[PDB]
Amino acid sequence: SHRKYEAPRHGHLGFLPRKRAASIRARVKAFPKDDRSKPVALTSFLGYKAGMTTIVRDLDRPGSKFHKREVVEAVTVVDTPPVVVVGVVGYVETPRGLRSLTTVWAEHLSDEVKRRFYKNWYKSKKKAFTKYSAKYAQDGAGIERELARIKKYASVVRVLVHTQIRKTPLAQKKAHLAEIQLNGGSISEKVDWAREHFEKTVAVDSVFEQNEMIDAIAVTKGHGFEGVTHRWGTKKLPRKTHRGLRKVACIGAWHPAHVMWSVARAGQRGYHSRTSINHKIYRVGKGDDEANGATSFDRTKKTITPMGGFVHYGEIKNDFIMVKGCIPGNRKRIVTLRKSLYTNTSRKALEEVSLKWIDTASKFGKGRFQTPAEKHAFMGTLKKDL
Amino acid sequence: MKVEIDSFSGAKIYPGRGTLFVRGDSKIFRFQNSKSASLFKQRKNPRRIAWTVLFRKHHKKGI
Amino acid sequence: SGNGAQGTKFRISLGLPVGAIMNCADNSGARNLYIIAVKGSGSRLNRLPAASLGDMVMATVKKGKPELRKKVMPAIVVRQAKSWRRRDGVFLYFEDNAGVIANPKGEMKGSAITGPVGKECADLWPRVASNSGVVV
Amino acid sequence: FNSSIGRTAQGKEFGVTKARWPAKSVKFVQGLLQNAAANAEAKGLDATKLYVSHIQVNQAP
RNA sequence: GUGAACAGCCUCUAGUUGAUAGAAUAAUGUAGAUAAGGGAAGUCGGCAAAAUAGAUCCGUAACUUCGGGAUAAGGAUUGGC
RNA sequence: GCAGUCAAGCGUUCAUAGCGACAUUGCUUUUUGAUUCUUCGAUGUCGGCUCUUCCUAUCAUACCGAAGCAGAAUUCGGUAAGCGUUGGAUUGUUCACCCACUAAUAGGGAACGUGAGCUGGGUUUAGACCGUCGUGAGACAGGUUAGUUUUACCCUACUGAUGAAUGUUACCGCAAUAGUAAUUGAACUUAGUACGAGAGGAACAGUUCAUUCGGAUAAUUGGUUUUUGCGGCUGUCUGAUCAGGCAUUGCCGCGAAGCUACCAUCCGCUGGAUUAUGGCUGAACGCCUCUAAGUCAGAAUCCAUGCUAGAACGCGGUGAUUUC
């Protein structure tokens, strides 16, 4: 009574349970190795999934069989406002886990964070941190003996940060919040770094640069209670069959007199916190700038915004990160950007990229043109003005 | 850009677009999008349809 | 994977399963091939061995000059007619389905071909490239 | 009697997450407790210091 | 009226709007569909589904009890003015 | 069916590289028997389709040892079940036997898995035909043909979803644990070299890709179309035109957003401890010796870094805490 045609196994034994995820952020569940020798920097990030567009590229794989040629490939430009630090907090060591010890905060948190803690806003008196913002008046013993508490103890240290939801056009108006660790050394100057980046702004240039590969860990999109043929990708039946076709029809044998946990069954797809690995950053522009959709071999003065606007998103007027391939999660998510888990020399990463041309076509419809004056400069004049 | 002119409607597409098409007489075609493909292979004629550029070379609107 | 894949084929979208009456483009005489298998293909329950360009097949013939029939000769395919994609951005698709018999290794039994030839069957088989027609 | 009932949102006001909006019983219960208010005015007392103290329903023929 | 028509479709003269209803678009269903490239490779079996249809012109074999086969097979025309 | 001790013999002379005469000891019920313990106030019995888990008595992959192994091809074993194990014609097929692909197409178990999942071709029904046996009614483990497959809303199991109690409530979290996954090939160079008298003819790194599975994504091609968006058409209806109803969503052409496809694209990481195995040191056994004390390297093995849930009875940090 054996299988009689021996086949592989549907689904994957290291992604289940696949239930609807806890946070709406992705949970940053892992961190790199801290390098004590190299100076203080910043490691993970927080970003908004906005664009997903083609790009063409010179191939640089010397010895291969498409050397010096062009390749269309999807870039996933993940846009970001320049983040703004609000405080730091450092865990301490014990044989039970990384237990949190103390928090410190800035002196005037903006109006874009005081709506995170209060779930209702208009009925709220808005008393947030006001009996905490009376600590800055005295001679300096308000912070520094708790700075002494995080200096004297507490091996590992984090920094919690919120993104400016102001300069990115979506209707939340309510900033998210997370933590990101510090990859530097000399735990004094770890927090002495954050001792003067309180309430100011740090952009993407502090760590994220050219050819610096990242992985993304995000929250994928869901579609509900989708059936078993599409959840686990399993097999249909012949047409002849009574009582259902999109199901499976032998769960388990007589003994065990239960169902096995490994059987493909209906339920929830999507809205997990899945994790890709080993993407590639092509290019990073700058924020307060216009006409950075241009490159070396193009020269055409144009913006990175696809014509008119995006699809379901809007515009981009900030500094941004090209990411090759596809990152999980649809438009308008909270995708974070973790550094390398391991120094990769796979002869496919760390080869230098030179973008021949990036596209800014009309992404909503079946797009036709790239720069908006060229559409006037191609079809000429119309019955209307322009 | 790899500079491209359509072989059916004279419209510009920059590569990554359009079905390049061939036939048993070794004559290469390439189209502009999906819209010019299925609107061709059912044996139409380019010289009598309005939205192409070759209609407006024939009656001379917009030169 | 195949016995004689001098170089490599790339991920070309495979759309000729076993049992497709594809015609030929040769002067050997046997006008139609009957495709039968793929050299070094996947093996999963109730899926067909599907073919693509380049990689040779063991296709028998079906009607022609009847000293070729009832026998299994290694053949090679040149034109697919399914919308694949190159790395160059642009991408073909034909209208016929080519077939060439070439049958110890891929040296051609016929001495001529007919019609266009895809770019991808050039580097992988040298013998076709010497006596080819116009290559697209 | 709340097994296989369609659970809705407004149960978290009171403690458990199961709730319906009966109509043909709330037509009668507040239809009859105004007749309770019609009786206390024959007993000469307020309408604000009251509370319903003992409800009772049972099977009928 | 279109048509070959008492077929199918639409309306007039006569009759009803009677079937427990309101909100949402998950699985699985019931019904109706569509699918590129391959054409039975699926299964006991081309089971269901798809192609083919109407008139008009041409051409039509084995076999036969010469009555048939036969619309054999197979091509081509079809609008409006 | 599988595996052992024994060894006249074969193997060019040599029993044991491999095989083994005449004997002889066992092991699993993957077959068939024998027995009738359990149900006759009913366990849905053949085979096929769908799909999880397990055992190795290993076909391939990892790593080693032996040969009448010079290489290549092979055979014989050793740890290992982690990973793969097919597409077809005929038959109702289990097994049967052929064509073809491959790293190979290994052997089985889970009420001879699986009918409140199907299929109903086989079977034992009631219809019919035919051969044989009978005077006949009829028989035949003889052949052929047409023959309703019923209910889940209960409990438990499973997959997802919530959720009272704790001072209230909102963030930031940390890990107890539980699951775990990537796997194989081709070509170039190595190189016509090593090895070979020739005939033939490898490998480790190094490059480029591919096969099977898994995870995500919608730019791009394709699919989908009630957006009835736009355009055309047939019949009817509004005195005609425009403007439109009426065909179960009239039909036809294109196609936006959306959803998905190895029919589209991208991605699938390392570290330790170990098995077999080969050694160092080293006796008992003055030499000897991988083991008895220690020991060094070692597999696709195990466990960790990583990936996923986060215990609704595991816990912490930090706000604000009802003037009346």
Side-chain angles (χ1 to χ4, degrees), chain A residues 1-97 99-386, chain B, chain C, chain D:
Chain A
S1 298
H2 54 87
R3 189 187 290 267
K4 190 258 186 292
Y5 284 109
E6 198 160 2
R9 199 267 180 197
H10 289 175
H12 194 277
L13 279 308
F15 291 98
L16 75 161
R18 56 181 63 244
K19 69 177 179 65
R20 293 171 64 247
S23 296
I24 296 91
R25 293 178 59 246
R27 187 178 179 183
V28 180
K29 289 175 64 65
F31 281 155
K33 291 185 263 74
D34 183 78
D35 281 332
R36 295 294 301 273
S37 67
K38 298 303 291 182
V40 175
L42 187 142
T43 302
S44 296
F45 195 70
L46 206 290
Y48 299 150
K49 197 262 187 66
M52 193 269 177
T53 315
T54 67
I55 200 165
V56 303
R57 182 180 180 270
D58 286 328
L59 284 179
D60 291 331
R61 288 190 296 271
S64 63
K65 289 186 283 188
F66 281 101
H67 184 71
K68 301 287 102 175
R69 194 65 63 84
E70 294 178 354
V71 163
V72 294
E73 198 275 334
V75 71
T76 57
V77 289
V78 49
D79 297 338
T80 171
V83 301
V84 41
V85 175
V86 76
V88 88
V89 150
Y91 296 103
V92 57
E93 292 181 353
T94 196
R96 279 75 175 265
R99 189 176 64 84
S100 61
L101 195 275
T102 183
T103 331
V104 292
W105 296 87
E107 75 278 14
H108 297 295
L109 76 162
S110 178
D111 204 5
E112 302 185 0
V113 185
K114 291 171 69 176
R115 66 188 68 249
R116 182 70 177 171
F117 295 105
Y118 294 117
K119 191 181 285 184
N120 289 319
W121 179 253
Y122 63 100
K123 289 185 283 186
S124 298
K125 183 65 184 296
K126 304 180 264 76
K127 195 66 183 297
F129 282 161
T130 57
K131 288 184 184 296
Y132 189 74
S133 178
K135 189 172 67 67
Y136 294 89
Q138 61 187 359
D139 57 355
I143 304 168
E144 289 293 330
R145 71 177 67 252
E146 290 83 6
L147 188 272
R149 183 66 61 188
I150 198 70
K151 281 282 291 296
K152 189 177 180 181
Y153 295 142
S155 175
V156 291
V157 64
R158 303 285 187 265
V159 57
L160 66 155
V161 66
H162 75 280
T163 60
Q164 279 186 353
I165 202 67
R166 183 176 297 173
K167 297 181 179 69
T168 301
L170 50 88
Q172 283 177 352
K173 205 193 291 183
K174 180 178 173 184
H176 295 89
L177 182 63
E179 70 177 1
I180 48 176
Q181 65 96 31
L182 280 303
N183 55 358
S186 174
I187 311 103
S188 180
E189 71 185 359
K190 283 182 173 287
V191 72
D192 287 327
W193 180 80
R195 182 60 176 83
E196 56 93 15
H197 287 91
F198 277 163
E199 76 261 4
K200 289 173 69 177
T201 306
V202 48
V204 299
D205 59 351
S206 65
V207 51
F208 290 95
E209 289 295 327
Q210 172 59 260
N211 282 312
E212 185 171 0
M213 57 85 67
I214 49 94
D215 57 344
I217 168 172
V219 172
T220 186
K221 65 187 288 186
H223 303 88
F225 190 70
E226 193 72 27
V228 64
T229 55
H230 187 65
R231 189 183 191 187
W232 298 94
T234 183
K235 180 64 179 294
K236 290 176 94 288
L237 270 303
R239 187 194 60 80
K240 192 80 176 294
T241 306
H242 191 201
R243 299 185 185 182
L245 302 178
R246 297 287 186 92
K247 61 177 73 174
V248 67
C250 175
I251 295 98
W254 191 278
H255 296 295
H258 301 88
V259 303
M260 298 293 288
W261 64 275
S262 174
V263 64
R265 296 184 69 86
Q268 173 66 39
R269 56 92 62 89
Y271 199 73
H272 314 285
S273 66
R274 296 303 188 192
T275 306
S276 66
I277 196 170
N278 196 352
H279 295 292
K280 176 65 70 178
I281 289 176
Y282 281 163
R283 184 262 189 89
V284 173
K286 67 184 291 292
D288 296 332
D289 196 5
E290 191 270 333
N292 293 324
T295 179
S296 174
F297 294 158
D298 191 7
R299 179 73 279 281
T300 302
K301 184 257 181 65
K302 63 186 184 178
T303 61
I304 195 66
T305 304
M307 284 182 64
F310 279 102
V311 181
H312 285 80
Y313 179 77
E315 294 181 354
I316 173 61
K317 294 183 264 75
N318 296 114
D319 46 355
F320 53 92
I321 290 95
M322 283 70 163
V323 170
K324 186 266 298 297
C326 296
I327 58 101
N330 54 1
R331 310 286 180 182
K332 201 190 292 183
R333 292 294 184 186
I334 303 299
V335 55
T336 187
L337 287 309
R338 189 173 64 189
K339 293 298 290 293
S340 179
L341 281 306
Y342 63 98
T343 302
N344 205 169
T345 314
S346 176
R347 296 284 299 275
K348 183 256 184 67
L350 61 79
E351 292 291 328
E352 298 293 324
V353 65
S354 180
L355 302 179
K356 183 178 185 293
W357 171 63
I358 189 169
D359 179 77
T360 178
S362 179
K363 188 55 72 71
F364 181 79
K366 185 64 179 67
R368 302 288 308 277
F369 299 99
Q370 283 79 15
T371 61
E374 184 180 359
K375 186 175 93 277
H376 182 270
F378 175 67
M379 66 178 68
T381 61
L382 304 176
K383 180 179 182 292
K384 66 174 77 173
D385 197 1
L386 184 145
Chain B
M1 286 79 169
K2 178 59 69 178
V3 60
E4 188 273 338
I5 299 299
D6 192 5
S7 178
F8 181 74
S9 72
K12 294 178 180 178
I13 45 94
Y14 291 151
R17 309 298 187 92
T19 65
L20 189 145
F21 180 73
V22 284
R23 198 176 67 251
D25 295 334
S26 294
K27 288 185 96 291
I28 178 168
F29 289 168
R30 65 178 61 86
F31 292 159
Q32 182 261 314
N33 56 358
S34 181
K35 184 177 176 181
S36 295
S38 177
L39 188 144
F40 171 71
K41 64 100 176 179
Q42 51 91 34
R43 194 175 292 113
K44 198 185 84 271
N45 50 0
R47 306 187 72 252
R48 292 180 67 184
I49 48 100
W51 61 267
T52 190
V53 69
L54 192 144
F55 184 74
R56 299 192 183 190
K57 193 269 302 297
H58 193 194
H59 294 85
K60 293 185 288 294
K61 276 86 74 173
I63 47 93
Chain C
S1 67
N3 293 318
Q6 292 296 109
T8 183
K9 191 174 70 69
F10 302 99
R11 184 66 184 89
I12 304 304
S13 183
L14 65 163
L16 285 175
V18 48
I21 179 164
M22 157 263 287
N23 53 358
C24 80
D26 198 78
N27 54 3
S28 297
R31 63 176 66 88
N32 53 356
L33 299 175
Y34 181 72
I35 195 164
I36 213 162
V38 174
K39 294 291 185 66
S41 69
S43 299
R44 188 179 178 270
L45 182 273
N46 280 314
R47 67 99 52 80
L48 286 312
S52 176
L53 287 317
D55 194 359
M56 75 179 80
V57 300
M58 292 295 287
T60 186
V61 303
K62 189 171 176 64
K63 62 181 181 290
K65 289 179 68 68
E67 76 275 14
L68 273 301
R69 295 189 296 116
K70 291 183 182 291
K71 292 184 288 292
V72 45
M73 289 290 108
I76 188 169
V77 59
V78 173
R79 296 188 291 265
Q80 182 178 0
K82 196 274 305 295
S83 181
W84 62 76
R85 184 169 303 275
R86 282 204 293 259
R87 288 178 181 86
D88 297 332
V90 302
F91 57 94
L92 284 299
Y93 66 98
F94 290 90
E95 287 290 326
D96 57 354
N97 300 116
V100 173
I101 60 168
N103 55 1
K105 186 261 187 294
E107 56 270 18
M108 191 179 293
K109 183 173 174 66
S111 178
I113 55 171
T114 303
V117 168
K119 304 283 107 177
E120 297 171 353
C121 298
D123 198 5
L124 208 149
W125 297 104
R127 185 59 59 88
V128 178
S130 67
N131 53 6
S132 292
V134 54
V135 189
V136 174
Chain D
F1 300 104
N2 57 0
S3 293
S4 72
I5 206 66
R7 71 189 191 279
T8 184
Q10 293 179 356
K12 290 176 71 175
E13 177 184 357
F14 286 153
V16 76
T17 61
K18 293 181 185 181
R20 280 178 61 237
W21 293 275
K24 199 175 180 179
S25 66
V26 306
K27 188 67 182 69
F28 286 154
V29 169
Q30 71 182 357
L32 263 70
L33 68 90
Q34 66 89 28
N35 205 170
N39 290 320
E41 60 187 0
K43 306 297 288 184
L45 203 141
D46 200 0
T48 58
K49 61 179 73 173
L50 270 297
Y51 66 95
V52 45
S53 177
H54 185 274
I55 38 87
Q56 185 75 39
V57 288
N58 49 0
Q59 291 91 13

